[PDB]
Design an enzyme around this catalytic site. Sequence first.
Site, short mmCIF file in Angstrom:
data_model
loop_
_atom_site.label_atom_id
_atom_site.label_comp_id
_atom_site.label_asym_id
_atom_site.label_seq_id
_atom_site.Cartn_x
_atom_site.Cartn_y
_atom_site.Cartn_z
N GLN A 72 0.84 -1.24 0.00
CA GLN A 72 0.00 0.00 0.00
C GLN A 72 0.86 1.27 0.00
O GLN A 72 0.33 2.28 -0.44
CB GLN A 72 -0.96 0.01 1.18
CG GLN A 72 -1.82 -1.24 1.22
CD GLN A 72 -2.92 -1.13 2.21
OE1 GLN A 72 -2.92 -1.88 3.20
NE2 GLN A 72 -3.87 -0.23 1.92
N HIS A 174 0.80 -9.15 4.96
CA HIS A 174 -0.30 -8.14 4.78
C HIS A 174 -0.84 -8.29 3.35
O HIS A 174 -0.63 -7.35 2.56
CB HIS A 174 0.21 -6.69 5.11
CG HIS A 174 -0.81 -5.68 5.56
ND1 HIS A 174 -1.91 -5.31 4.84
CD2 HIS A 174 -0.87 -4.90 6.66
CE1 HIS A 174 -2.61 -4.40 5.47
NE2 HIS A 174 -2.03 -4.14 6.60
N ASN A 221 -2.04 -9.91 9.02
CA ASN A 221 -2.91 -8.72 9.11
C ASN A 221 -4.34 -9.13 8.76
O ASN A 221 -4.54 -9.57 7.63
CB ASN A 221 -2.40 -7.61 8.22
CG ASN A 221 -3.42 -6.48 8.20
OD1 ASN A 221 -4.16 -6.34 7.23
ND2 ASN A 221 -3.48 -5.76 9.31
N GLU A 222 -5.29 -9.07 9.69
CA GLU A 222 -6.73 -9.26 9.37
C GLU A 222 -6.95 -10.52 8.52
O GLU A 222 -7.44 -10.47 7.39
CB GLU A 222 -7.27 -8.02 8.66
CG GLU A 222 -7.03 -6.70 9.35
CD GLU A 222 -7.77 -5.51 8.75
OE1 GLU A 222 -8.38 -5.66 7.68
OE2 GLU A 222 -7.72 -4.41 9.30
#
Lengths: 542, 541
Positions: A72, A174, A221-222
């Site tokens: 990102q 991620h 991550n999540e």
Amino acid sequence: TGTAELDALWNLVEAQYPVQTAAVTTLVTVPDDYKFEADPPSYALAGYETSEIAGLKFPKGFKFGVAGAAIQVEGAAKAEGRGPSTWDYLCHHYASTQCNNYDPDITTNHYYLYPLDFARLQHLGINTYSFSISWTRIYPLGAGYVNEAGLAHYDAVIHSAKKYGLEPVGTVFHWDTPLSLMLKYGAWQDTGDQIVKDFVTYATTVFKRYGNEVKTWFTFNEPRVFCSQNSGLPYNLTYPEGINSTSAVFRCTYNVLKAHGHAVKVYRDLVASGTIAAGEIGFKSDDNYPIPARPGNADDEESAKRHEAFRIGIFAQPVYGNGDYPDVVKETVGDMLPALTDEDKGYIKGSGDIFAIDGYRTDISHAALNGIANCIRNQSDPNWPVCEEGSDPFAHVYPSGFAIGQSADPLSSWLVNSAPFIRDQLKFLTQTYPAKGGIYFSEFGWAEDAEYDRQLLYQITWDGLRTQYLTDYLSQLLLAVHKDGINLRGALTWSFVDNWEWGLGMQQKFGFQFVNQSDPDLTRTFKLSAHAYAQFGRNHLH
Amino acid sequence: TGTAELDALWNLVEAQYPVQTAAVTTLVTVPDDYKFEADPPSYALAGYETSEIAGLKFPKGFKFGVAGAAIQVEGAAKAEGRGPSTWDYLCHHYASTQCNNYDPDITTNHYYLYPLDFARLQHLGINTYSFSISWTRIYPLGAGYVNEAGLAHYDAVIHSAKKYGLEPVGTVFHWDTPLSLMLKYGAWQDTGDQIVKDFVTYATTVFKRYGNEVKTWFTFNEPRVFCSQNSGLPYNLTYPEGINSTSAVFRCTYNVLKAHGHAVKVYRDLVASGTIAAGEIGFKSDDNYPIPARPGNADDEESAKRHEAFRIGIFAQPVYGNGDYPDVVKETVGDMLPALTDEDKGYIKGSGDIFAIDGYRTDISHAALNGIANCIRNQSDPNWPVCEEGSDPFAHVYPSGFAIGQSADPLSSWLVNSAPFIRDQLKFLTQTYPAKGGIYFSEFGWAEDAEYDRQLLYQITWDGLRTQYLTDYLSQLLLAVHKDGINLRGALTWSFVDNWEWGLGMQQKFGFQFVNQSDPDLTRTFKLSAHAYAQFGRNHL
Ligand SMILES: *[C@@H]1O[C@H](CO)[C@@H](O[C@@H]2O[C@H](CO)[C@@H](O)[C@H](O)[C@H]2NC(C)=O)[C@H](O)[C@H]1NC(C)=O
Ligand SMILES: *[C@@H]1O[C@H](CO)[C@@H](O[C@@H]2O[C@H](CO)[C@@H](O)[C@H](O)[C@H]2NC(C)=O)[C@H](O)[C@H]1NC(C)=O
Ligand SMILES: *[C@@H]1O[C@H](CO)[C@@H](O[C@@H]2O[C@H](CO)[C@@H](O)[C@H](O)[C@H]2NC(C)=O)[C@H](O)[C@H]1NC(C)=O
Ligand SMILES: *[C@@H]1O[C@H](CO)[C@@H](O[C@@H]2O[C@H](CO)[C@@H](O)[C@H](O)[C@H]2NC(C)=O)[C@H](O)[C@H]1NC(C)=O
Ligand SMILES: *[C@@H]1O[C@H](CO)[C@@H](O[C@@H]2O[C@H](CO)[C@@H](O)[C@H](O)[C@H]2NC(C)=O)[C@H](O)[C@H]1NC(C)=O
Ligand SMILES: *[C@@H]1O[C@H](CO)[C@@H](O[C@@H]2O[C@H](CO)[C@@H](O)[C@H](O)[C@H]2NC(C)=O)[C@H](O)[C@H]1NC(C)=O
Ligand SMILES: *[C@@H]1O[C@H](CO)[C@@H](O[C@@H]2O[C@H](CO)[C@@H](O)[C@H](O)[C@H]2NC(C)=O)[C@H](O)[C@H]1NC(C)=O
Ligand SMILES: *[C@@H]1O[C@H](CO)[C@@H](O[C@@H]2O[C@H](CO)[C@@H](O)[C@H](O)[C@H]2NC(C)=O)[C@H](O)[C@H]1NC(C)=O
Ligand SMILES: [Ca+2]
């Protein structure tokens, strides 16, 4: 098939259009005479902090920080031997349909600009920098050969962060799945266990390399959000025999839990062998336990429970709870979710030193209008498997017709300012999923209303709703420590920059700094919310 | 021509496409036991009020209210003998260029929905309703014949408002110039004085008709903004001999000042006759005294003063001051602005019982970058005649690069939340332009960040920045009463409904209620900001 296969994969990724290259492809030197833009006027933060938190401090050693993720923020998608992710392929082949005409080739160019980014975070009194490591910087093909230049990149990033007084918190994965593993055996839909071996080899390398300097780790991550993306492109192009779009989610769930457990075992062994510093490892949970739409109505109570089980419980109960999936999840998905063996439970149970919640919001749960029992029995039901009304006019709305709080903007309509519900969430999570090292608020932030480069700089930088949400949310964390006795270790805002937001690309702005995507230099400007964040730290840390 | 000329003017207005008719053409009321939508949750207004106003009250009789204007809210553009305005013409012939493809045919249909509107304002504790009278409902040709059905409409509106406990505050003219007067002699650009006579006969009729029930009056809404519009369409099609697009503005300024003075003298004599109730009359000023970009820099200090003189001073100094135009204005515009005679000053000087400011915000004044002196001496200079940098990156920004406050949507980028500057504005206005009856905050509100025809109702109704602005602005008005001793008579928010905003039509949302323009019933829904406004009244009246 080493650098040779790397070439092949990039040739497949670039068939329709090549990876674009940034205007700046050298590490930036923060110049001697560098001037931060002037502070907003003295009255600008008046009215945000309430008298209720006057004199309240976060505990000693509180991590007061920002969060980004490799894909990102970095750019340099092909620089220094990096291999392609699933997202490199998705956005170069399906840009208009899945990627909003953006791609992660360049994003914020943090790969080269981090020194300047860190000097600006230091200006704000930030004390913690949460980053993710790009798997394909380390193993360009997910398994096989190691990319030394990639290992060296993160050494230099971790060293810079510490010099600028930022405690580095590392996330191993991620969502940037290596394309090579997707093509070879389907990556996280693997019905074997090569995904678990390949992840663990990778986690082993980055732990040995960095965990003298990094002492707080998150494996995933999540994982719940990531596994739900495995139902679509590009993963649905490579499903093994026996996997479809529904089962891929629960195959991914199980393989991630295994990867996590095996990775935390290697982390503890490296600590025990004295090879790295004694630190703390967990994973970042997301979502919430929603409030029932109609208090005392058993259907809304049941649907809110189902929400928590499938969005949080499915990963957290095995790790921080009794060591098994929620019974509600088992009863609903059946064989599609592989049974945890005694051996699986051996690694997974107790594999979280710290809990971490991406506590963005809290939702309202209306039971499915066609009936919870009807919805459970039909995997094609759009509300399956939680079997609440999942859409925006239900998720965010009381029976009254009034919302739970401020909405963020239709493109990010999952996001509401729900600060009053934060303490109830933390109370639930620390009692249900207790960890020895306590709990992180590992992500929270605002995607601001008008600003989607509609504007001139002065209109962008006075970001009242972001500033309100971050102060709201920080205020409630202070009260969680002081009124509910929560062992809260940190607060990490997403993000320090407008960045590349998956399917929405750079159209979603989450930063407390504006990044100018029409400027070659991708110049950062502090928003009011960055000063709000700085002022909250000066007032409530020590 | 009478009925006959009315027809002709509508046939000229409707040449390309007719006036549209609402799905509802009858009076809408609600029964006493009708259920409004449920309140927001109990925590929804937490955080908005600051501790520093805890327990502070506005004066006894403080007018706590809302503001609308006839053409922006009524619709029924041709109902019951109404004549056309300049805007009826403009938006039927130049919709795509001048009107954003909207027109004031229907707007919020307040002409038929007012009983419902008043019941909903009563639910919020509102105690004052500010409205304008449509000149062309009363004299469909601006002069000549009187339309009884139009006089009867406002009787019924004023009666309904009082029954719902709203003190009615009347504006005689809110920019809706009669088309007939524009065609006959150029209306406000008249180099004669028939515009003054025609306005005064009109003002006299509505004063005798309503001023037993209406006791606070404004002759003109924002006359400086109105005169600015006379530089363009449709006024520039009908200029008399010797009027320009530049000079039209200052001809309009002078004729409005005369109209005002003559009309206030009629009002006072009516009061003295006892044929209407003893009340108070003024006009609504707008705009601000800006803060110089670089305080103590003579050029920015000068450009700030030029802004105040041309945006406020040109009307307020003759009325509330020494009875003449600001010296900076005379020295710049010369003979385009007719000299005030002893006789003009006889009517105009002292012709404000009350001051009223549409105090939406404060600007910043940067002197013209090409040099204040060079700009003044031009006329073609885009920054003439104020000779500050007029555009958004200058008017709202410090030399630092940071704004004066929160911006509203780019469509309404003139609007900022500048609550900290409010007390300074009221201090300057009451000291410079003193009125016996004190000062109204006659308009303030927010155009909320792109809530328009993009959203679901839950997203619209939680309007945080509107709620913030209105609480900010009410807080500072309360403090101006206590800390500065301001004789503040009222606070009237623009507006109680999303309405027709001139050149932007219904795309700009200013309401503390949402109006559903995809619903035939034009259904109103309370926004959080409406409950914020209600709660502030309950806490601080
Ligand atoms: C892979 O998943 C993608 C993501 O949903 C599917 O996407 C859509 O599927 C429908 C059904 O035909 C298409 O009409 C949509 O237009 C698809 N969108 C795109 C971007 O292609 C897709 O069907 C799946 N593909 C395979 C091979 O299963
Ligand atoms: C996806 O595969 C799963 C199996 O992994 C399918 O779910 C089963 O469907 C069979 C019929 O093919 C039923 O008899 C079973 O009761 C279902 N099993 C479970 C665990 O519910 C599912 O039908 C497939 N989905 C699609 C989209 O074809
Ligand atoms: C399961 O729910 C789905 C979608 O909400 C329904 O699927 C449809 O079933 C009908 C009737 O057999 C088909 O003709 C449609 O083409 C299906 N697809 C969609 C997208 O609607 C189905 O009605 C539900 N099944 C049960 C038993 O309730
Ligand atoms: C983003 O970056 C661009 C690139 O420099 C800025 O554009 C410049 O704006 C200045 C004056 O504001 C002009 O002198 C130049 O003509 C512009 N340069 C180019 C190449 O366009 C732009 O303003 C920045 N945007 C924001 C919102 O800050
Ligand atoms: C009245 O003013 C308008 C502008 O307010 C004039 O019409 C515009 O003029 C510009 C400059 O010539 C054109 O390029 C625009 O396209 C015109 N707008 C429209 C909608 O037609 C008009 O000419 C002026 N009339 C007089 C008599 O001077
Ligand atoms: C009518 O406007 C014209 C432009 O449309 C203006 O031109 C000037 O007239 C002034 C009066 O202020 C004279 O002093 C000048 O000789 C003219 N020249 C320039 C360069 O402006 C004009 O001002 C307006 N007419 C009147 C009588 O006010
Ligand atoms: C008065 O102001 C006008 C309007 O800005 C000036 O006109 C511009 O100036 C230069 C002349 O060298 C041209 O390049 C521009 O094209 C002009 N603008 C337009 C709209 O044509 C004018 O020069 C100024 N006069 C003085 C004496 O300062
Ligand atoms: C405005 O009122 C219209 C008219 O009733 C509403 O229109 C409905 O819109 C929903 C949108 O989700 C549709 O599914 C309904 O079937 C529509 N009905 C008609 C007749 O169009 C609309 O919801 C209202 N909008 C808001 C924000 O309140
Ligand atoms: Ca506040």
